[PDB]
Amino acid sequence: GLSDGEWQQVLNVWGKVEADIAGHGQEVLIRLFTGHPETLEKFKKFKHLKTEAEMKASEKLKKHGTVVLTALGGILKKKGHHEAKLKPLAQSHATKHKIPIKYLEFISDAIIHVLHSKHPGDFGADAQGAMTKALELFRNDIAAKYKELGFQG
């Protein structure tokens, strides 16, 4: 698992995210959608957005970014004992949204990219390593639930 120090670095940079959650959520989704257009196809509401500029102007996209990062934050703050918080997310993403684990890797990388660009003082190499591990644990645990839920992931 992650060490105490690793979780501390995760929570330290997450504090920076909480200081502007909608701006971060917007930037994460835009990075995801521009880098991986196949992921955008999973969003009925948003796949009409064909450029970064149209995405930036979408208030609905911004609100969803906040929904995503709020849920992720709740999971991260549970550190290694995140199963109760993770469970409903795994269930909805295995049934309603059908999100492959690969797409969770893509959003993990988008989060890391945005944190590197926005918060270089709180997201140096050790902090990035810690967040990488935290998001790996998130994906791994979702993948385990997907199996139970009958989704190939």
Of the candidates 123, 150, 148, 118, the one whose C-alpha atom is nearest the C-alpha of residue 134 is 123
Q: Is the dihedral of CA 53, 73, 17, 106 positive or negative?
A: negative
E-assigned strands of the chain? none
Cα–Cα distance measured from residue 135 to residue 33, given in angstroms and rounded to the nearest whole number: 19
Cα–Cα distance measured from residue 40 to residue 45, given in angstroms and rounded to the nearest whole number: 9
What is the DSSP track for 131-152? HHHHHHHHHHHHHHHHHHHT--
Cα–Cα distance measured from residue 53 to residue 68, given in angstroms and rounded to the nearest whole number: 21
Residue the block writes with tokens 């469970």: 87
Find all residues with CB under 8 Å of 126, minimum gap 6, and list them: 9
**Is the separation of the CB atoms in 10 and 134 below 8 Å?**
yes
Q: How far is CA 145 from CA 81, 133, 137, in A?
A: 15, 19, 12
Q: How far is CA 41 from CA 3, 46, 101, 125, 140, in A?
A: 37, 8, 15, 33, 23
Residue 81 identity (one-letter amino acid): H
Per-domain residue ranges of the chain: 1-153
116 marked as part of a ligand binding site: no
24 marked as part of a ligand binding site: no
Residue 77 identity (one-letter amino acid): K
Structure tokens at 109: 């990388």
For domain 1-153, give the CATH number.
Answer: 1.10.490.10
Cα–Cα distance measured from residue 56 to residue 65, given in angstroms and rounded to the nearest whole number: 11
